[PDB]
């Protein structure tokens, strides 16, 4: 009964839901040879968050917790980062969630800054608390990347100035993109273990359709390349659907990308109730649209509605 | 038409003056401050003000390019030419204080500058070299002139910053010794006064104080627990901007409710300019359940006497 709506925000006014950066462009490509199963940026149209998705863009690919020395064999440059929920409470692995909310959902070298503020002991003041921050890398393919079990390993370079203190990791980008695989999930509990509670994979089923992504290019610490990350819907749509909780009348909401000045429709797309978009497009290309453009809801249709080609 | 407030808890919302989740509500007297932040400024009918923009991740961020060292002879300092956040060139002639998202406080903004080289005479996105380094942007430096199109960034490296497209991702403060969250930087440097400012705000009704959404900020080093106070959360700003609901009076009466029990913890005045006041005297925390949130109840006058907090 409650009407379903889409935010009127332009692309440049919205945030990637898999990495805390503005969206750079719309993009489409064939993906039938990938398993497209991101865990951040997952929300049904009636507002059900899935996977590791939470509501604060600034907590995507962030970690909170504390350092407990080095790992059981690693370098003097590798540290045991015990992690909590983004709110400070212990992470409960018995819930069917893949990992603490916001955990990265790709195989790669997550680069950012670890910051510490001491808890302090025999004296007392929030002033007088010592602080330190350093660059660090969290490898999501490391044997000690076990966020579902409550810890990840963080590497720092020549730096040994890391204490057993409350810590937070602010993501910046990738250390390199040698083996960055955005459609390969990490093993959230380590080698040879089962990921549970995952948001499902998504795929176009209707002939001639591809997924439409919201794409952001992301920084690197070093090396060559222009890595990017594709999310299914923007973070601001997730926050909007979560609050509205409008029921989905069919499996597919027909949406039109419109220039609000002219009323011209640039193209149409299918917004699936699972929280992802398909277009009638073949090939690997950006979607050129005016900066003022946005998606508008038109009607509820079926999975068999045939979109105009774009 | 009908005005609404998001049903998010504070831990589900973002500070509109620095890209971090909100930690707590706080109230204190502000008589000895000019409270004129430029980020996190939006009217209830959805008019963005100051340097406010809609992407939380762009708060205290810069995009642009490095053009060598700054005018002096300091090998640690670099000239950061800045653009609009969407990559278009910044126009200094408009009545805006600075590029959107520029920091609105005096302090040492600490973060990471990242570079991805532009295409040359061979070229792929695959052939572009990258580098990132820690850096600090002092908002009181003589060369902090964002309204003139550039800021100075200091780095520990002296030799691995190129004249290339650059972005600054904020992380926190370098230290907090002279961090003043209620003092605006000189967006054009020392020769020129600030322009295009969102107006300053203060309580007026007897016994009222501003209510803030407060977040602690990380530091690169040094001692302290700095925090930053915003007037309304970024997610409220995004909501009001989209709704553009007309403000029926100058004051929305809002009640902070525990949704478990339905009990009202306290009531407050949400002013049409986009800030909150409460009936409380003194520097004080606000003890509320983590699940609570503000609910819009009715439009009242500036003369409405709030129940003491
Ligand atoms: C962590 C650190 O100290 N990095 C240095 C280092 O960076 C190098 C290094 O990581 C090698 C390892 O094979 O790979 C690159 O060369 C990397 O440099 C980075 O990437 C290249 C492509 C350039 O864009 C370079 O500017 C960038 O830093 O050495 C460099 C200088 O050689 C810096 O000293 C880094 O801080
Ligand atoms: Cl490991
Ligand atoms: Cl380029
Ligand atoms: Cl360095």
Residue numbers in the entry:
A (entry chain B): 224 to 533
B (entry chain A): 225 to 533
The paper states:
In the case of GII.27, we obtained X-ray data showing that a single A-trisaccharide molecule bound to the P domain dimer, as previously observed with other GII genotypes. P domain and A-trisaccharide binding interaction was mediated by a network of hydrogen bonds, a hydrophobic interaction, and several water-mediated interactions by both P domain monomers, which was observed with other GII genotypes. Overall, NPIH26 norovirus exhibited a divergent fucose binding site from human norovirus and had structural constraints for binding HBGAs, whereas the GII.27 norovirus bound an A-trisaccharide at the common GII HBGA pocket.
Noroviruses infect a plethora of animal species, including humans, dogs, and bats. Indeed, a recent study showed that bat noroviruses bind histo-blood group antigens (HBGAs), which are co-factors for human noroviruses. In this study, we observe novel structural factors on a GX bat norovirus (NPIH26) capsid that restrict HBGA binding and demonstrate that an emerging genotype, GII.27 binds an HBGA at a common pocket using X-ray crystallography.
